[PDB]
Scaffold this active site. Sequence first.
Site, short mmCIF file in Angstrom:
data_model
loop_
_atom_site.label_atom_id
_atom_site.label_comp_id
_atom_site.label_asym_id
_atom_site.label_seq_id
_atom_site.Cartn_x
_atom_site.Cartn_y
_atom_site.Cartn_z
N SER C 267 0.92 -1.02 0.05
CA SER C 267 0.04 -0.08 0.00
C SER C 267 1.04 1.12 0.04
O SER C 267 0.65 2.10 -0.77
CB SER C 267 -1.04 0.06 1.30
OG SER C 267 -0.17 -0.20 2.37
N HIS C 295 -4.69 -5.88 0.17
CA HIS C 295 -5.21 -4.52 -0.61
C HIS C 295 -5.37 -4.91 -1.95
O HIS C 295 -5.58 -3.96 -2.68
CB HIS C 295 -3.85 -3.68 -0.48
CG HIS C 295 -3.81 -2.84 0.68
ND1 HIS C 295 -4.77 -1.69 0.94
CD2 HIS C 295 -3.06 -2.99 1.74
CE1 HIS C 295 -4.42 -1.22 2.04
NE2 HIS C 295 -3.52 -1.81 2.64
N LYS C 327 -10.54 -4.17 3.86
CA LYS C 327 -10.07 -3.04 2.71
C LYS C 327 -11.15 -2.94 1.82
O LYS C 327 -11.78 -1.88 1.58
CB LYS C 327 -9.00 -3.45 2.18
CG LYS C 327 -7.62 -3.90 3.06
CD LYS C 327 -7.29 -2.79 3.90
CE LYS C 327 -5.94 -2.96 4.67
NZ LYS C 327 -5.60 -4.07 5.18
C1 LIG Z 1 7.76 14.40 10.60
C2 LIG Z 1 7.03 13.46 11.58
C3 LIG Z 1 6.14 12.47 10.59
C4 LIG Z 1 5.13 11.68 11.42
C5 LIG Z 1 4.35 10.31 10.72
C6 LIG Z 1 3.53 9.56 11.52
C7 LIG Z 1 2.40 8.51 10.91
C8 LIG Z 1 1.52 7.63 11.67
C9 LIG Z 1 1.02 6.51 10.82
C10 LIG Z 1 -0.09 5.53 12.14
C11 LIG Z 1 -1.00 4.50 11.30
C12 LIG Z 1 -0.53 3.49 10.45
C13 LIG Z 1 -1.57 2.54 9.84
C14 LIG Z 1 -0.99 1.18 8.82
C15 LIG Z 1 -2.16 0.93 7.75
C16 LIG Z 1 -2.34 -0.65 8.01
O1 LIG Z 1 -1.87 -1.37 8.71
C17 LIG Z 1 -3.67 -1.14 7.41
N1 LIG Z 1 -3.46 -2.50 6.68
C18 LIG Z 1 -4.78 -1.67 8.46
O2 LIG Z 1 -5.97 -1.55 8.25
#
Ligand SMILES: CCCCCCCCCCCCCCCC(=O)[C@@H](N)CO
Lengths: 423, 49, 492
Positions: C267, C295, C327
Amino acid sequence: DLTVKEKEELIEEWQPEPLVPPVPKDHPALNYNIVSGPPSHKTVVNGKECINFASFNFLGLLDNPRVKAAALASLKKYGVGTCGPRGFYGTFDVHLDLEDRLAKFMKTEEAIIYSYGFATIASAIPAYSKRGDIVFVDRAACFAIQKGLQASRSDIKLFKHNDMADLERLLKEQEIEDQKNPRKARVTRRFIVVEGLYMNTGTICPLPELVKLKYKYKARIFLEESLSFGVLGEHGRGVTEHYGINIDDIDLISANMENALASIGGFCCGRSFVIDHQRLSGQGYCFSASLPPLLAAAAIEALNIMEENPGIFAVLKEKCGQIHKALQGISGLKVVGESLSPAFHLQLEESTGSREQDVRLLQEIVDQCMNRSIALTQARYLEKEEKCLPPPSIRVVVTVEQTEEELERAASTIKEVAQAVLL
Amino acid sequence: RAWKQMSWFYYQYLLVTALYMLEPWERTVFNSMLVSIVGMALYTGYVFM
Amino acid sequence: GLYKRPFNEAFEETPMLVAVLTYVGYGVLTLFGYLRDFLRYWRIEKCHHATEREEQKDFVSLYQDFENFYTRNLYMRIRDNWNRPICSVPGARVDIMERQSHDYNWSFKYTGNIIKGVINMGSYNYLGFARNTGSCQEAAAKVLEEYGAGVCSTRQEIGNLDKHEELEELVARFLGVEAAMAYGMGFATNSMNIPALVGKGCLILSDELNHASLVLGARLSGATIRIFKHNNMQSLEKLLKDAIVYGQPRTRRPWKKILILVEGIYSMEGSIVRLPEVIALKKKYKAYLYLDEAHSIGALGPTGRGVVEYFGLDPEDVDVMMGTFTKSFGASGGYIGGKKELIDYLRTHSHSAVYATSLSPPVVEQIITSMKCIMGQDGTSLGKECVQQLAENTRYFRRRLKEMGFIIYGNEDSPVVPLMLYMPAKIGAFGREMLKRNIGVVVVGFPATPIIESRARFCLSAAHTKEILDTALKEIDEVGDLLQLKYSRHRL
Ligand SMILES: CCCCCCCCCCCCCCCC(=O)[C@@H](N)CO
């Protein structure tokens, strides 16, 4: 080194093992019990009308009309799925509402909702425990705790079930290694992982002594409340309310919403200083879709029903005591558990040397009981994967739905069937 | 007018330097360091070159 | 492996100046984070963050400071771009509860306003099955009335229901395999069924960009884990050769098994696995294939059967086919499909089958109804139309974005569209500016993506009409002009 011809010969002659080994046709776990309709009180299992004594539905909220009405309302509002993780538009207002309600119910600062009951603790434990940390875990800990301990790479020190002398001996020894090396000690974290009411034994942890040992040897306490969350205490708040311990003395309290709340999911509650870490470190939380809104609304309505009527815990306690007392005295079975436990065990007093023979005997009792309108289940384990494998047992689960005469009849039927089988 | 163009230029400077993510006082600290370094460089450059 | 249709993916290299500026921005922001930690050390500024309680101040500190340096200084500054609460069904348009923070994202206050009709590019509903009305909703309502929400036991215990068997039969027919098994969570599906298949003495060849669930499943099993480059069949073949030739590391014994964990669609990258080559390699080197098809199970395929149908391959060639119902189908859960022997072994030996609660009955009913809609059993052409509409939306959106001048990763047929932001400040700026313009987008950095390549992911849907896509594209063009996000050299 090797010639290319030799290497191609090696590749040609290599035969892998089959992906799955052959499985015996006469495997007990191979035959599932098909339940026709809901798994409620007075259910149909394997085509037979039976009184349910197997499912962990302690408060009878599975077929509560209010819970179903709340779930239907949330379904009509949102649909079934959330279509994303909590990070990416998978956070509904029902999730924040449920977290707030759980935090207010448990008298804690914060709660965090996982969409799967195993994952809540299997991901809470690795988040705080890292390489080099020392975890003192009860040997009779559930499989989810074991997988959470394995996912973290910390040292694991099993101590004997509810033995505070064993835990204190382990802590004094760890203090000795702390004295040997000070610098690594200053950065080494200590966790005591216990379960409020153990599923594999049906016993209750010695929480006051655990708190005293925590403050003496400076080890943070993680407490699993899957069974005790909605059954124990005056207001059904867990083993902390049962013992009178301040909930601040427990660093993390993890339960699943699947037993007493009767809906899919789990939660972890505690101070925000501890809980806020899991929202970015909990793998089952970050990398999994959030709980469907109808399940969240069902859990919220279950919380409402528990708060409005705290006499359900009293009636659950009296029914547990009744069935526990009635089951005492079986000729070939011993009751393993405590009177205050809703789910306890019926193990064999004299075990044959072969474990599968014991499983076959217990299944004979279970089958003859299902022919007599009682739905019992045998405690299922992964024999190879379990660290401390519990003995085979029949699991007796008590519910406020089961009436007094139903409990007496179940005890008498189990007695008769077991005394016939074990004769 | 052209001041809006210079404001967009300042906005681009913020995005590139990650000052967009910082609080106003941190932005002021960074800008003070920037003008200080610029002044020292200009002083050394005029003195010798 | 032979490809029937052309396989077109593009991963344009980061411009050198853009990478330099990204390093500069990350460096200055880390220096300011160091200054913030220093200031908080002598309490020069108040601590919004929670602290350990006074009774427990003499314990070894729960968190090492440097470990969360990212969370407190990097992520916390732009935290308003995540965890946005929604008060509506996540369809093409979603309602977002507006929230504000007066302490720089440390705590949020929820204003009464609700942002209504936000174009949803964050939710996963590829086929537009996220609805609060329709046949799936009515069937789920009926099954919820009959069964209630949730079950209170395990499948091996009294927790196996006729709904579960019906679902597993339907899933097996859908995939094209002999048998299938269903689980309450896809993350759990991976983490709980990979340890059952392999153990110590086996080898796991895992893709570089595998999901966290796949990595956790590989770690929970005691097998050796070796990583190959993303969709690099040369790297994978070299690893297979060396693994077979040289055996286990300490004692050069032959491996018991070799398992290749791949995903149908990655993804974050938007790339489709080179499945024909992977199958050819596993046939040559006698490996087993674990295809996580979360996905792509609804998104890809002429009839929405996934990557296997997308490539025209035999489903029986893949040893294990994972999938997730979240999904595309619009309900929680996961599944594993395979031969009857595999599924019987999993029913006996899966961690989820023994210790985890079964799927919810309303959820399985919604899955059943959606699957029958897709495979044409609903009696209406709606399931087909969803597949063609998603394909059209993907092609249109990707072509329009690429000819605007952005850098877009992945295969041209992938409904997930990652757009490169490349700078930490632009991660927050893009999310804020797009929400300001009534489009909800997802932006991701370190915990999901590598350092320099931080991105914004668009999930396309069959619910998205062409008017919605045009509105989103127009606002994306405007924001890319504003934020200078058109880094591409080839097209603009
Ligand atoms: C400068 C600083 C940058 C900050 C970036 C932080 C990002 C946070 C993401 C947290 C959520 C991740 C979900 C993954 C999707 C998933 O696993 C799907 N398969 C489940 O439905």
